[PDB]
Amino acid sequence: MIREERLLKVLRAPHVSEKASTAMEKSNTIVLKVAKDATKAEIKAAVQKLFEVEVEVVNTLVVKGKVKRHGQRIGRRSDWKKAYVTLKEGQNL
Amino acid sequence: AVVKCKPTSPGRRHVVKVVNPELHKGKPFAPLLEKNSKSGGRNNNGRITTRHIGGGHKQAYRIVDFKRNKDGIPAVVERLEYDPNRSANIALVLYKDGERRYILAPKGLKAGDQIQSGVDAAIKPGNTLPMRNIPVGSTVHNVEMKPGKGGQLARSAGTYVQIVARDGAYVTLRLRSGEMRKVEADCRATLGEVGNAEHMLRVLGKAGAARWRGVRPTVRGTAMNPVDHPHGGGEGRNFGKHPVTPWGVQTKGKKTRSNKRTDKFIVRRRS
Amino acid sequence: MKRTFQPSVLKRNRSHGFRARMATKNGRQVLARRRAKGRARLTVSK
RNA sequence: AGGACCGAACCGACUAAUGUCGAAAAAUUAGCGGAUGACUUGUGGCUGGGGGUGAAAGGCCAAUCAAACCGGGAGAUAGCU
RNA sequence: GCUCGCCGGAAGACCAAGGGUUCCUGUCCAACGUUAAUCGGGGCAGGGUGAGUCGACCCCUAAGGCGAGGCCGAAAGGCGUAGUCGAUGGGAAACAGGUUAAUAUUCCUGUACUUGGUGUUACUGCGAAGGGGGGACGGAGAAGGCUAUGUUGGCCGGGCGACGGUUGUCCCGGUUUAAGCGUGUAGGCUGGUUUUCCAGGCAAAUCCGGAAAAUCAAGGCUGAGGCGUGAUGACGAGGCACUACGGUGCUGAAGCAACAAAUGCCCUGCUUCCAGGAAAAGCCUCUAAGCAUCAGGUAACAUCAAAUCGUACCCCAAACCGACACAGGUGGUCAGGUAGAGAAUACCAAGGCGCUUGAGAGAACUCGGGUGAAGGAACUAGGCAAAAUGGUGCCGUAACUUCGGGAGAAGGCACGCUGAUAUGUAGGUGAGGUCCCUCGCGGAUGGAGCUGAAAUCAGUCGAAGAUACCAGCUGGCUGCAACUGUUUAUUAAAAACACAGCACUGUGCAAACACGAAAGUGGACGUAUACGGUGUGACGCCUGCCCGGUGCCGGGAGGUUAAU
């Protein structure tokens, strides 16, 4: 019974992109930014309570941030989690 | 088992094949198969102890029931098998119990022979017991040194010992080499010789053989440079020294033996 | 001409790994020597 | 059957020619030897300095080996520049 | 965009390993790029990397490491026992198609399947750090069958030819479909099956082992392939409509037969050979303790899950390695069509590329090439190179000898192409029909067609038909060393090395010895037909003396002399 305490935490963000919209339309699949742990089932229940809707199943992933340099100094973004998250049918917000 | 093969190859010239046309073509008996490691000379530390060692083909194991201590329960051989772990050959027998084991071979040992061990053993070869009850004089082999050590004697191709004397509690025995040694009569041993004695007929002519008989080349010592070996030097093929161990101790003859733990068993040294 | 360096991240580890050094005394006797000098990087496994 | 032959790959380095500030801190061009076996190459692992291993040449050991590298002694010492 | 050139057992595609954002979008040209730059692995920004099934992780070990105890050791600590991890190995199962600029067996469609859990059901002996089995293994050959694959026809659909001809032996393309499932084959192995009993499998066994007795010849097990299902689906030339001149949407015909046949599969097969050829888990049996009413297991149903982590991209390389976008090196997977013995040799296919300065000019001298009159090695240290030869099939072919070889000895023959033989023959293949049988994916049958040498003979062009490439010079005398082998990563490849046997020697196991501060290593899981060391080198003939010296093996009578 994933505790809402950790749960509400887990999610980082919803994301926007062409492919995101494209999954949205062709499949009703939601397109997000979420934590480092962000295990699939975690995400499942998370969005499931957070939109009161009927998740089908998700795809997990790992971004690799770019190692850009910032003036002279070099850096690299800490990585995060998108996910291909869909339902059999749903109303998007 | 002797056949000269025909000199079709420069390099097949002096070969000598050693063919027992009775050796069982096929796979050994699982109940005696055991994993083996190629040491190549190394030690626990890993340093190569014994030299020219290494390579050699994969090579299974056949735990020898040297002890053969099973008494009163008889067995019959079923197959003589070839083992690269020996120069002799191994013979699976079937104890009346049904438990199975290879054994090493007397010469006349063939398929269809029924034996066992024990002090009341028959005197047909292959059986074994201690030489308190083995009659004197008999030519035997496969001999223990201490009671129940298992047997480290005459273990080899066409090996066997003939009794020279039996000393009350004791017995002196003619090693196939020529030293005679007291051994306790309760030390067990197997009657008869060993077959297969023709190994020496093989000449391993191709470099390949010893290669795949697991032999590194061995230097002609002095040929190398002084840099490491006792022998050495020579602005071309010169010794002018003494033959000594590769650590410096004279060879071509030095009495080096000093056990003294057992020398009281050295009745007459080997020549 | 197949020159000196060849790569293996696995072999990096089993070569000079963090666990490697810290498991042996002498290894345990380097981390300071650099921390003494204050290297950014302890070893090469990052 | 063959430590067989001819000869692909593969491994090797015999001859010459560039090339020797070169494209490469050893190449390629013309060739050339082996080409089922002492075959050969990965991946894994083992071996340590007056040590290792070496089908021996004093070889080879992170290009670097008649004693690896690196730290220290130690600013070694220098009837010599 | 056009034309041209180049590769293609790769300069193509896919991977590991490494790379660790470079890929694509958009954007700019400082610098980076060796010229210019509008282009980019270059600057900036955004994006994209989706796994119950593909790896990893995971279960197990493998050679290895570490190491409680301990043993050994100045202290470090050596070492191993229990253990315990450590892939290049083994272990449950996914695919076709579509899908984007950028991924995809993970996304969409459809069809799978596999592994636990959960319960419901009825059946109910299960269960193990342990028993056994299996997993399970070498090399060399050799088929055969199939198949991808490839060829032709049939088919469709397109078309009628830029100049002689070109409505047909016409021309151009296409002529498709997974897993699994059910089939169960060519094939391969296999005696089954029952009862009894037994010092065996560390107890225990009902199992493996064995003994017997019986008792019947069948079953079992394996195993590609092909066939039905798959798959009335999709794909699928093309067509059509729209245009973002880049793709959308719908329709989408035909989509079969035959041939040829793998370095692939049946193959862990078979058959042979000695050099004698991992393990343990996963799996199956078994029972101990224990409980066997419970539990647990059998299975039918139903249900659920099947974490993460990896996942783009690059790769014979501009991204890996060597300081460069590198003429050097880096394994694995695939493997077309043309002649061809052919993974090559040439030249194309899909593909891909045209190597980041260019342009003129045409002396020397180079550097690679080709070309050559007579001469034909006189050149040169040296016939170095170059040249010169080379193939296939046949004839014929020495010295000498370990009888094998040499010996591709040499030397010569001949070779295109068309026709006929014989409008394709030999051969291979096998249609239909005919039957035969326990009915099959059965068999004899017959040869339909089709594929298809080679030879002979005929005829004939050239100068030449091994026409290109590709593709040994050979002789003869010998020194050396028997050679296959090794060798100086980088100036040397042999005679140097090793090597087969041979002898010497040393050594009978807590063996010698080597390392080891000692434990304890390897030897050797061996017991002298064994191993060490040395010397030497196949083989055939042989291998003499000098024991003074110097070492070694022995003998001790006396001189000799420490420590006490």
UniProtKB/Swiss-Prot annotation, chain A:
GO CC terms in record: cytoplasm; cytosolic large ribosomal subunit
Source species, domain of life: Bacteria
One example GO MF annotation: rRNA binding
Family matches, as SUPFAM superfamilies: Ribosomal proteins S24e, L23 and L15e
Cross-referenced InterPro entries: Nucleotide-bd_a/b_plait_sf, Ribosomal_uL23-like, Ribosomal_uL23/eL15/eS24_sf, Ribosomal_uL23_CS
Keyword Transmembrane helix: no
Matching PROSITE patterns: RIBOSOMAL_L23
UniProt KW keywords: Ribonucleoprotein, Ribosomal protein, RNA-binding, rRNA-binding
BP GO terms, sorted: cytoplasmic translation; ribosomal large subunit assembly
Stored HAMAP family: Ribosomal_uL23_B
Function noted in UniProt: One of the early assembly proteins, it binds 23S rRNA; is essential for growth. One of the proteins that surround the polypeptide exit tunnel on the outside of the subunit. Acts as the docking site for trigger factor for Ffh binding to the ribosome (SRP54) and to nascent polypeptide chains.
Complex formation: Part of the 50S ribosomal subunit. Contacts protein L29 and trigger factor. Might also contact SecE and probably does contact SecG and SecY when the SecYEG translocation complex is docked with the ribosome.
Family of this protein: Belongs to the universal ribosomal protein uL23 family.
Protein name: Large ribosomal subunit protein uL23
Originating species: Escherichia coli (strain K12)
UniProtKB/Swiss-Prot annotation, chain B:
Gene3D superfamilies reported in the protein's UniProt record: 2.30.30.30, Nucleic acid-binding proteins (2.40.50.140), Ribosomal protein L2, domain 3 (4.10.950.10)
Documented effect of changing residue 229 to Q: Loss of peptidyltransferase activity in reconstituted ribosomes. No change in rRNA binding or assembly into ribosomes
Biased composition (Low complexity): 38-47
GO biological process: cytoplasmic translation; negative regulation of DNA-templated DNA replication initiation; ribosomal large subunit assembly
Keyword Transcription: no
A GO MF term: zinc ion binding
Gene Ontology cellular-component annotations: cytoplasm; cytosol; cytosolic large ribosomal subunit; DnaA-L2 complex
InterPro entries: NA-bd_OB-fold, Rib_uL2_dom2, Ribosomal_uL2, Ribosomal_uL2_bac/org-type, Ribosomal_uL2_C, Ribosomal_uL2_CS, Ribosomal_uL2_dom3, Ribosomal_uL2_RNA-bd_dom
Oligomeric and partner information: Part of the 50S ribosomal subunit. Forms a bridge to the 30S subunit in the 70S ribosome, contacting the 16S rRNA. Interacts weakly with S6 in one of the 3.5 A resolved structures. In pull-down experiments interacts with CedA.
Function: One of the primary rRNA binding proteins. Located near the base of the L1 stalk, it is probably also mobile. Required for association of the 30S and 50S subunits to form the 70S ribosome, for tRNA binding and peptide bond formation. It has been suggested to have peptidyltransferase activity; this is highly controversial.
Assigned protein family: Belongs to the universal ribosomal protein uL2 family.
Protein name: Large ribosomal subunit protein uL2
Swiss-Prot record, chain C:
Family: Belongs to the bacterial ribosomal protein bL34 family.
GO molecular function: structural constituent of ribosome
A GO CC term attached to the entry: cytoplasm
Highest classification ranks of the organism: Bacteria, Pseudomonadati, Pseudomonadota, Gammaproteobacteria, Enterobacterales
Bridged cysteine pairs (disulfide): none
HAMAP family xrefs: Ribosomal_bL34
NCBIfam families for this protein: rpmH_bact
Name of protein: Large ribosomal subunit protein bL34
Gene Ontology terms describing biological process: cytoplasmic translation
Pfam families, alphabetized: Ribosomal_L34 (PF00468)
Keyword set, alphabetical order: Ribonucleoprotein, Ribosomal protein
Keyword Ribosomal protein: yes
